[model samples]
Target chain A: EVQLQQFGAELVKPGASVKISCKASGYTFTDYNMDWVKQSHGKSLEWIGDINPNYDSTVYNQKFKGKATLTVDKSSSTAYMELRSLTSEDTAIYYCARDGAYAMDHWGQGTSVTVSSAKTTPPSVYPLAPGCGDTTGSSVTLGCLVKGYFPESVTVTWNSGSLSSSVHTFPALLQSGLYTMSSSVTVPSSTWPSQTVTCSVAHPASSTTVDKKLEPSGPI
Target chain B: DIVMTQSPSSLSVSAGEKVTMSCKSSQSLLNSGHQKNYLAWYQQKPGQPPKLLISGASTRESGVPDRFTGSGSGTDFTLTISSVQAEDLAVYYCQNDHRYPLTFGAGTKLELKRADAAPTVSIFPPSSEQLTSGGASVVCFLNNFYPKDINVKWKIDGSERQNGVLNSWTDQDSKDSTYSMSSTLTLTKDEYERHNSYTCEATHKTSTSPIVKSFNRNEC
Candidate 1:
């Protein structure tokens, strides 16, 4: 009956730090090990570090040494990770997992951390026409660049339909102080000459639905 | 691309037996300044997130059993279990963290070597003929398997294709302890048309014969 409870989402400005918590229950908290994992939106998982509550010892992935700090409170049965010097790179969903012989069998729900800037700016969209990709596969890729967005909240959809599930959006990256994000969709190359697809972006700061598409000679 | 190769895909052992596995990386993972190899070993039970066993090649994560040892340097490494316990029957992986795109070894399964249930493999076609990518995607679900570690491959017209294959981590059903995972294969229109047949093949320790589920493009 092990459970790791984590808080919801957190929106913090760049340069500020965020301390996320995971409360463990239904087991002896100090007997097992705990770990923190970071998963950037639409990306893979990254191991930050692990802590042994009993000994109060910790180990971190060399890459995250200075970026994350792991600690625990025995009385509250809670584990914490204080991510410091925040930036767009730190924007990800964090999960705390309990480990024993089984290894990370129990996990927290996950906390979404959005490292954003205080200023509000509309995103600029640059849509690219479908182009041949992966010569070996005969696939066409359609892409868009949504740059200089602030507050870090936006949605990019494909075909303006439910098919958005097929799109791959990269996590927004911060450059200097602005955020640059990208999304791409791949379709069969043959469909392109006859079929049409679209890219639509939504940003609260922007009033219009930025939609772009190319009139394909196929499909209809 | 960094490649990680693991050997002796699986092992059969009884309680108290010692077990060892090998992982070889394509390039040296040693960090000159830190004098540590950016390598790690993880143990994953059926239906669990891999728990970090060791980092820096040889440094054990906190609370990790002393019986579990990781040793080696540069491109070659070993993970050893001094006295295997029934509880330690799980899959193990070695990961390299030296570069931008991290790589993980094909998992090695440590099993008690007895009768176990075979996975039920089924291929589900994408609801729509066209995937969001404009290509078609098919999902193969493997369920109710024991010992957890299973190898999956996607083949088109009898030839193996690795380009668009993605395998999710194995998940355990808490109530039954059986493991389940899904593998997906995406095909461009050309590939789908040229090679009308697609297959998802799974190999698990429980059975010598590979479990296969296939779909034909004409079915669409």
Candidate 2:
């Protein structure tokens, strides 16, 4: 398995170029081609191009002609790209990608590039599904769907008993792409339906401290 | 510059099944040096963007699934999904990233194959280019060999031209046959100097679709 860790955010001026790096670990650098992608602030992504470290050959996005340049150093097991002629419109999260058979499937944690002196805002939270109603022996499943994220990495937790009780955080998926995850636990019906269950979500920049509680709706 | 276009732009798939996708380029991706073609493949999952999968026609990207394979080179390339997975349910895209105007195949549905019958799919370029200029006559050419077909067109910007003269021919030798075609356009010197992008699209008639290649000769 290959692990790709990217550089942190940077602030640049207009007409300037910002270069970002994606470091590859646990694999031969020349074995695969390194790709670049652009995601404008609060927008969908656009494919930049790719570079083969083994050959140093590159295929760039025509639209990115004067805006992006893809390069690599096989000796360092690293790939780099410079986003030139930067503007506020260029402010967004740029990511390093790996080619899969069907498309650019795997992604690195994105590196934010602010073309101006704009400040980085805290991650925003959106309400997904409401809390599920409690069900005893009938069994219940709770899920969380996070959208607009690449190189998907997220965590979900479950809390039983009182709100102050210890919370259990589940494992996360590290692949770069969109994902939906769920965590479920069943309790005995004999305990009655008075107990409350909650699900919380945690992202890279934001953590949800409030929990969405689940309670029985109808007669047990 | 060869311009590539994809349609629908998105798709879905399931696990343990097969799916097929197509890619088309504005011009042929064939090189006259060896009379060979260059085409490539990629996959872009949700959240994540595009990744290189197959390149130089049918070569697979490293660490790609064996179930995923590419056939055909030049103007035509095919991305076959042998067994799909819930994890595989993401947007799939193809690119002739090898050539300029860097084209891509419109995306296709990768749903679970019903009854083991592969669906007959059609991928069309959403746009093309028209080559025109001041006092210059340019012509486009194409060659076809089943399991491999190369197409070429002269375009400016990103739309097709209708005023040019077109011609095609075929030759058979022993086990394989060759198909050849071309298009001619008249232009002015200024137009020729300002817009001199001749595009070639090569495809594998049998399995893959088309890969685009380009040539630009601008006057000083």
Candidate 3:
């Protein structure tokens, strides 16, 4: 007799953040695993992530690693997921389902999140910067800052020489309806005078891309 | 990202008929170890929690009738219901549980068609040798029942027993799309002797009256 009752639909502006709730009833809430799922329009569904309510351990789908945050309140028998830096691409019907072993067998009524930009004007890429730091032979952290981006979705890739790595975090939304994000790299030894680093950010689904100037040691 | 494609938006079948559906994943679901495909099937009747039917490709869940079979690997998969019943009129889903972002088939509705048949009942009482003490169990097997769902009642004299009075109610495959079920009741040696007259009654939607079978010590 386990049941999951999700919150109602949500319609919010772009560049915002939303937290959806799912309440549990008829069973021991902490005894089972609760997962979040996403349905885009009415076509396809995606597993966002899940939280073990007993201890609050979490696992997120790589695609939603930064976009979705999963949490649960055992005392209240409720599960929550917060979606940040919202964009039209984030619009979907989300559900909370219980797992039977490895399978999701029970689901909650879907809660919809529609990120609409009333202005109809999308945010452009932000300007990049090189952190002011010591270029001398010393271990230091280097970072590049991007400012004033909108629609909340972006991808960041750091490249140093032939080394390349992707960041699992995203920019944070500001009060002014803009986003600010920074990517940092740590150099354990002396900085190479010839060493170069670049930050590439983009939202493929949104057809937007931006690149920051190379850094002294910014993450690859 | 693996995409599971399910076909046939809906299907119609009688209580004693067969039903089959397909699911095609965008990638191989087979794992190198033990060569087991990570997949499952679920049934979602309206106004109730979805129940798992089969898992790991073909392993039926406990309490699930044998008539529901899951098969196939790599990109192709199939879920066949050997028999359809009025109670089986619901949405059926297939899911791939190999990894994160669990996803399900769009869902196919199992519609009940006319010309369905009713269920036939069979009862197996304790053997004469058990009248002493070695065994204390009798089984009620209902085979070839249409409208797949049926209930069995165990009564001493004319009083119906409650939960825990009977051990289990399990479903099995019969002929064509017809299905079968078995309910076993294990009794204490002391209790069995006192309830000299034991009866097994089966209730079916199509039957005008409940089917009854008995196990009397005299018969034993």
Candidate 4:
């Protein structure tokens, strides 16, 4: 069986940068390409890009253009990627994977990076939705919004035992203006009596998963 | 760079049986910028070409089967065949669309659900489209479409043509599925503008008349 080993944990100051590596064993170095993936606490996986050692070719996720750089060294059967402009929001587990002909099959045990001790101060975490805005005992639609991010990638879920669901939607913005992404989850009033709803924002560097409850209060 | 590899290459399964294919990439596909994850999956049928089956790794592509599921993360991802059927006997491919030179796993051959394995017709030089300046050269590409491992040949005005080099790679997967492959064809500026039509032919393992797909740069 092939194995992928990742580097150890790293700590960085906000505004600084960090790099990680993945080494492959039990396979031909030039036969397959290497890919990078990012996962934040309590969040799903995200694609970063890939690099081919045999041809020295590389492709980057447009979403990661400014934050990450993917590279590889065939001589050592190792793959590397660097992250820049770090911040607390950048804290997450980074992984290196093997790109087979069609998809990623082997992955490195992820390396966690913490930005808490970085030179720069962490950005204030904002509530996805106001705690008091949800209605109780009634089907309500709740929206979660995050700013200063592009190609918005976020998840929203309602937790009431009755039925929980999440929805991710993409909205096109005016080309001349800034771009943003949002997610919303709706809950029926019957199911909202004492249940809570959560909205999580995931990014390569920093992530936040927050939950709020449907109290007796009306929309705030 | 992420280098991908597969093992066993091909496999045989009875109807209603289960099959599993594994894919491995050389590097990590995760990016730390926006904290996003990118990975996808695909399938190719005999006589036809590959089609997208799963994107973002675990999310099924539109109407895919519930029995076909993708799991795992980073470099360790898997495509599980919960139940194999006669139609499911076609070769399966896994791709990492998150990065380019978009890599694919060597295909896993799924045998007939029953005793009679349907003959698989190969389709190569998968369909393509191109655009170029009226007087400038434009080249086309065709890679890894399977069932019939065929050589790619170019033709103009129904006359045989040879200009560029062809290189290919093959690998086995966990289930003994073999992945036969090829790369893009490059042409000089002068040749591309002068050739009115170009055809890519795939000579199947047993067929006398090869399957061919043709395109015209001038038509665009």
Scored by TM-score, the top model is 2
| lDDT tens digits by residue: candidate 1, A88-153 | 888887889885543455678677777776656777665544222212247655556565676566
In terms of TM-score, how similar is model 4 to the real structure? Answer: 0.32
Model 4 ranges with Cα > 4 A deviation? A118-220, B1-220
**Docking quality tier of candidate 3?**
incorrect
Chain B TM-score per candidate, please. 0.53, 0.43, 0.52, 0.49
Give the Cα error of residue A162 in candidate 2, in Å: 21
Error of 1 at B60 (Å): 27
In order of TM-score, best first, we have 2, 3, 1, 4
Q: Which tens-of-lDDT digit does each residue in A112-203 have in candidate 3? A: 56587633222332222222232333543333344345544445666633433212122243435654444434343444334555567664
Question: How is the predicted docking of candidate 1 categorized under the CAPRI scheme?
Answer: incorrect
Q: Name the top DockQ candidate.
A: 3
Interface RMSD of 2: 26.4
| Model 3 complex DockQ against the native | 0.08
Pairs of residues clashing in candidate 1: A186-B133, A187-B133, A187-B134, A188-B134, A193-A218, A194-A218, A194-A219, A195-A218, B47-B171, B47-B172
What is the C-alpha lDDT profile of model 2 across A23-139, one tens digit per residue?
988877787777787766424456678788878888887778778888887777888888878887887878896653323445687786756543322211222211223113342
Task: Give per-residue lDDT, candidate 1, residue A148.
Answer: 68
Q: List where candidate 1 sits over 4 angstroms from the true fold.
A: A1-16, A19-83, A87-220, B1-114, B129-133
The alpha-carbon RMSD over the true interface for every model, in angstroms, is: 14.6, 26.4, 32.1, 23.8
Fnat by candidate, in order = 0.00, 0.08, 0.23, 0.04
> Chain B TM-score, candidate 2?
0.43
